[PDB]
Design a protein around this ligand. Structure first.
Ligand SMILES: Cc1ncc(C[n+]2csc(CCOP(=O)(O)OP(=O)(O)O)c2C)c(N)n1
Ligand SMILES: Cc1ncc(C[n+]2csc(CCOP(=O)(O)OP(=O)(O)O)c2C)c(N)n1
Ligand SMILES: [Ca+2]
Ligand SMILES: [Ca+2]
Ligand SMILES: [Ca+2]
Ligand SMILES: [Ca+2]
Ligand SMILES: [Ca+2]
Ligand SMILES: [Ca+2]
Ligand SMILES: [Mg+2]
Ligand SMILES: [Mg+2]
Ligand SMILES: [Mg+2]
Ligand SMILES: [Mg+2]
Ligand SMILES: [Mg+2]
Lengths: 539, 560
């Protein structure tokens, strides 16, 4: 029990779980609220994080955990970036300094981290459907516990949230939805008792109101209003932002669509220079891709700027709405491969697998900003869809007016050697060049095209090499290694091949470097495979 | 002639020569035309008959193809094709080399979008409106969307974006689920709890969707107005062999659809497993769940046409200790890719996917061919994939999936399989293949529909082995190693794309074992397959028994 001061927390020191929180009287909850605010700011500041959303949520989370009995009652957080107060109140206060770090805890709720985490989230708008499943399962088991979902105003505009709300209406089952609105319809929300708006920062009035709502029949939306945040490095994103901004100046058919990730995708400058050629469709990736398809049908050259992990939401839209009529949609896919800190919900290691199987979708991996420019120019000037994927990370700035002629599907040899040849693009290529550096028999090819592959160069290298190594910042299942084995098979070439990539296992929050070392795709791990294939490494 | 007005109409220009007072007679001609020419090929006419009046009205008022008319799904657009120069092609609808059952951009300048999957019209319409405004043009964009499609995730999300952008366009909501009075009453209840004004959309109606003259007068007022507008309209044998309409030839009378085999299995299973719960995205009859829904009413959930909701709802049930089954077509499962990966697979949840219409479905074409699931499911960590040869293996796989940890997918085609007795619950080790025919010269690896081709192809060829590759994830590593070491050549056959499918799984597995047999990967090529019979598509793809026999002959097997 330390002295009163600027950063004492007498109440939190006694709270190890929600049961300890219930020992407080309602009148004490405003003081806890301020302790939680102080705790979040003083620990979760460095690295930015989703501090602003968690701060906005402190009072509704305190009230929910005071009124409800987690883990018997299920509190579901949409996305989960707003649940830092939830983790402090559920035995993880001492782990907040390590949030998103290897050996720490997730930046989102994760079922396997705590019995208090009802869903594993990261992708937005899943809380309502999960909530429905838990309510239906509860009713089937004759149990009586409460299901409460906390969803932001942004998340509630997602297709699967609105579709789920409609169903929650039709089903008429007991559940509470807290709409957490920090910005201040009849086809989605019929059958749903609406309550509010109400002050989202009044922890006593929220405890009062929840004790009323929690026991009512059928589904309730509680509309709360919250204040957001109450209390050398040249990125691939920037390289893209600069290339497309430059491109649009001399292509009036170019239109850039983002699903509400303008700053992430590096389109701040693009939004200000070309406001007439910029569309933020909101959070819905499915709307972004089908809208781009409508634009391409009317003679435009749309570019969808989207994270690899988020493009998963639009798989059927790419296949059905773009690929069937071979439409002019270019996909500039950021956060390609392991993103690291954000963990298994955000690691973009599936795009080379799910896009490859779609007829007519070309796939490029640029090694640098000049190749990115070459691919974007090709994509925007040739028929049908193209995907260009690049990681979170940096690359050399490139001079204005850099627009090389790149023949799509052509690989390039970057290092001499015929005994063993490493085939790799993007981040994997930099690993390959490093791994090969002192080995004269070890060739390196920039496999900068996954679809189509360079069949001629693969035939030449496949016919002479004692062994090939494939390296990809993607799952080894049906990805770049699979494409290479399928192309070798159809040529009836049978060289030794080592397929290096992410294993068929979800990768938890850590640095990309850690995931890459344990996956065995980094330069040291490639150097180990070369030795295993009988390459004489220098002493 | 029974159709004197229609006889002079070869396009929307001809339609506009009629006085409004002649339009009612024209809608009666169009209804009689659709019944006269499309009463076969198991075509459902209800949707297209219900839409005759609005489609006549839209073509009379708008200027197609300058004005863009977008049909959601496209199954309601028969009158559209009749009014846009395709009257004499309607006899060949869904037939190989005939017109599509849906609108298709390549078929006609009057078909604004290629559709089949629901709920895509609004986002496509937004795109066309935004391109129109960028180009300084002023043509009309109209989307026609059913009440069912409108409650789809991408439709509800699109309408939010449409409201925010405030761009000029007309959404026609074709509601055949509720009357005008039922709709008004529901809306009165809700806003007592304009509501569309905050969303940024003008709501007009509901009005009578069968009054072609009143629809014309109302549209003429709406097409001028700024911003997005919703017009809510309201519309109305005991012998040993039997002919199967679906497959277009004779089958044993003991043969029923895979759908019926699944419905019978899950209905029986749920009697002794109280944790089993079936979830369908509004395909009760298609997935064979009529009987299930009647016998187990409190273990049956229809979520409407929201595949993403069906999968994530099942995840919630699994997290609460239940054993949910998602009954879903392969093609519609594509909508739930992220939900399978993110909501089911990351925490390895107890969701069983029973996937109907797996492989080529035929008549419904490129938008419906379930030819990608062995590729897209396989790259998801922890998702097991089984291909049952018969109703017994389907039961063994469903029992395995419902009693073991994590997600399982069971995929089966449109088509028939032998009826099997109640209480058929074999014990099957997930991941174990079965040798069905001896031979070590050339071995065919195949599951499900491909397996039937393989066994037919290998008849009276003594050196040709056949393995039931009834598991795609995991593969049978032990049996593939043995066959891959001993066989001169392998043939893989899959009712799936050759890209990243079963053939790919086999080549990945052989590579990690450092085995180098000759392998012929047979399957659907990396190209969309247009409407035709499955048998026609399979013959041209090279996966039927004669195509397999030709590959065996090329590999130097003695084939009669
Ligand atoms: C499928 C998906 N697409 C995009 C994102 C990126 N994203 C993370 S937070 C968020 C939600 C928008 O804000 P809101 O739900 O209102 O939450 P707030 O931060 O305002 O509390 C978005 C777009 C995501 N998590 N999931
Ligand atoms: C994405 C998708 N999921 C499922 C289906 C299957 N399906 C075909 S039409 C339909 C019903 C659509 O209802 P509505 O739009 O009201 O049209 P109506 O049946 O009344 O003509 C369904 C579920 C589909 N076509 N697309
Ligand atoms: Ca689609
Ligand atoms: Ca193009
Ligand atoms: Ca290069
Ligand atoms: Ca050689
Ligand atoms: Ca309709
Ligand atoms: Ca299971
Ligand atoms: Mg103090
Ligand atoms: Mg918000
Ligand atoms: Mg893991
Ligand atoms: Mg309907
Ligand atoms: Mg084709």
């Amino acid at each position: 029990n330390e002295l009163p001061g600027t950063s004492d927390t007498p109440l939190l020191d006694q709270i190890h779980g929600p049961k300890d929180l219930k020992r407080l009287s309602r009148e004490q909850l405003p003081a806890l609220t301020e302790e939680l605010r102080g705790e979040i700011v003083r620990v979760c500041s460095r690295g930015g994080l989703h501090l602003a959303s968690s701060l906005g949520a402190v009072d509704i989370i305190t009230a929910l955990h005071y009124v409800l009995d987690s883990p018997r009652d299920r509190i579901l957080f949409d996305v989960g970036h707003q649940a830092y107060a939830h983790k402090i109140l559920t035995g993880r206060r001492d782990q907040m300094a390590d949030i998103k770090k290897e050996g720490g805890i997730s930046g989102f709720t994760k079922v396997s981290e705590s019995e208090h985490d009802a869903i594993t989230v990261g992708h937005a708008s899943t809380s309502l459907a999960n909530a429905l499943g838990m309510a239906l399962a509860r009713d089937a088991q004759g149990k009586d516990f409460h299901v409460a979902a906390v969803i932001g105003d942004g998340s509630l505009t997602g297709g699967m949230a609105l579709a789920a709300l409609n169903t929650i209406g039709d089903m008429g089952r007991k559940m509470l939805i807290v709409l957490n609105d920090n910005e201040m319809n009849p086809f989605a929300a019929m059958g749903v008792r609406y309550v509010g708006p109400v002050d989202g920062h009044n922890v006593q009035e929220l405890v009062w109101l929840l004790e009323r709502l929690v026991d009512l029949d059928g589904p309730t939306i509680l509309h709360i209003v919250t204040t957001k945040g109450k209390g050398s490095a040249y990125s691939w994103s920037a390289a893209f932002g600069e290339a497309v901004t430059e491109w649009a100046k001399t292509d009036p058919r170019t239109f850039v669509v983002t699903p509400a990730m303008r700053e992430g995708s590096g389109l701040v400058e693009f939004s200000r220079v070309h406001p007439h050629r910029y569309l933020d469709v909101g959070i819905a990736e499915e709307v972004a891709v089908t809208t781009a398809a409508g634009m391409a049908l009317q003679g435009m050259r749309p570019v969808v700027a989207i994270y690899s992990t988020f493009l998963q939401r639009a798989y059927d839209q790419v296949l059905h709405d773009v690929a069937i009529e071979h439409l002019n949609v270019t996909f500039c896919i950021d956060r390609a491969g392991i993103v690291g800190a954000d963990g298994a919900t955000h690691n973009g290691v599936f795009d080379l697998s799910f896009l490859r199987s779609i007829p007519g979708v070309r796939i490029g991996l640029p090694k640098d900003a000049a190749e990115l420019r070459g691919m974007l120019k090709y994509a925007q000037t040739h028929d049908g869809p193209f995907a260009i994927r690049y990681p979170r990370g940096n690359t050399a700035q490139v001079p204005a007016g850099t627009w090389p002629d790149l023949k799509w599907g052509e690989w390039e040899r970057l290092k001499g050697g015929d005994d063993v040849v490493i085939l790799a693009g993007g981040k994997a290529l930099d690993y390959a060049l490093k791994a090969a550096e002192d080995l004269p028999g070890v060739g390196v090819v920039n496999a900068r095209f996954v679809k189509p592959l360079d069949e001629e160069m693969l035939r030449e290298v496949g016919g002479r090499a004692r062994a090939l190594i494939t390296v990809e910042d993607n799952t080894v299942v049906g990805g770049f290694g699979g494409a290479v084995l399928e192309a070798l098979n159809s040529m009836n070439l049978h060289p030794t091949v080592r397929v290096l990539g992410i294993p068929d296992e979800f990768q938890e929050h850590a640095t990309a470097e850690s995931v890459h070392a344990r996956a065995g795709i980094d330069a040291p791990a490639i150097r180990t495979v070369l030795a295993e294939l009988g390459v004489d490494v220098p002493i």
